[PDB]
Design a protein around this ligand. Structure first.
Ligand SMILES: CN[C@@H]1CCc2c(ccc(O)c2O)[C@H]1O
Length: 281
């Protein structure tokens, strides 16, 4: 009776993920006003989320719901590669938009000539290139396989799909995909909050005839509680401890998919963008 029960949630998530990006892509495509410099980064994030939801979520849900994998193992390598690539692309896009906000707040005069529409495209292309390289190159060249005789049959056989990684690769991947964006975002947001507090104090100096924290409170919090634990797990099993189980690993990886799906809708709200949605509907 649980098979039908778990199917409903997966189907709802799959239906919602694509609709949460088609609307934004279509609205930003055919509206002149919504076009801006940060709009390119927003579209990059939305397209990455759409690709993730259209590619990895349905097949992964089919694998989880079914007893055993259906087709051959030839496509599995870049299935996993696309998964890791989209995750890295989303994380790095959030890091770069945070850096953009930091540059916007601190130096107003330089921002006019520092960033240009022509120069902005280079950053997105470079980050896509580096994420795609660090995703495809290790996965496809079979540099991530392990030597332990356990599950080597699963790697050899074309009927089961389990994720097994070497000690070295996991740590480097976690460091290059999670920790650096986290520290950069934390530092830049601390600086932004300090600037906002200073401005509020200056305004209060001449008055009499912190709400903004809430605006920050979500934008980082939903990132932490939804992505901090998994990578913390993604290292410990490399250590000699056998504490975690496969089901827990699968569930913590799964939660990240829902987090990535829900991120862009919460991230981008504006009266102009709201009326942009309104006109299309
Ligand atoms: C099988 N799922 C994978 C397993 C490990 C992993 C993921 C995503 C980004 C990474 O940097 C990873 O090391 C997960 O999506």
């Amino acid at each position: 009776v649980w098979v039908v029960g778990m199917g409903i949630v997966m189907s709802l998530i799959v239906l919602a993920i694509v609709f949460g990006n088609v609307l934004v892509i279509t609205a930003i495509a055919k509206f002149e006003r919504l076009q801006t410099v940060t709009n390119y980064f927003i579209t990059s994030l939305a397209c990455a989320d759409l690709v993730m939801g259209l590619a990895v979520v349905p097949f992964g849900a089919a694998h989880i719901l079914t007893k055993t994998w259906t087709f051959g193992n030839f496509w599995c390598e870049f299935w996993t590669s696309i998964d890791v690539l989209c995750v890295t692309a989303s994380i790095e896009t959030l890091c770069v938009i945070a850096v953009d906000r930091y540059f916007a707040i601190t130096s107003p005069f330089k921002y006019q000539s520092l960033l240009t529409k022509n120069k902005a495209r280079v950053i997105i292309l470079m980050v896509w290139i580096v994420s795609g390289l660090t995703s495809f190159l290790p996965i496809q060249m079979h540099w991530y396989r392990a030597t332990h005789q356990e599950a080597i049959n699963c790697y050899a056989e074309e009927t089961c799909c389990d994720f097994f990684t070497n000690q070295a690769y996991a740590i480097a991947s976690s460091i290059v995909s999670f920790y650096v964006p986290l520290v950069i975002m934390v530092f830049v947001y601390s600086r932004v909050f300090q600037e906002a507090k200073r401005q509020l104090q200056k305004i209060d100096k001449s008055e009499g005839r912190h709400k903004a924290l809430k605006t920050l409170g979500i934008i980082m919090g939903t990132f932490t509680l939804c992505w901090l634990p998994f990578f913390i797990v993604n290292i410990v099993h490399v250590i000699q401890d056998n504490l975690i189980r496969k089901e827990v690993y699968i569930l913590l990886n799964w939660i990240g998919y829902v987090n990535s799906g829900f991120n862009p809708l919460i991230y981008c709200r504006s009266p102009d963008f709201r009326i942009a949605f309104q006109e299309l509907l």
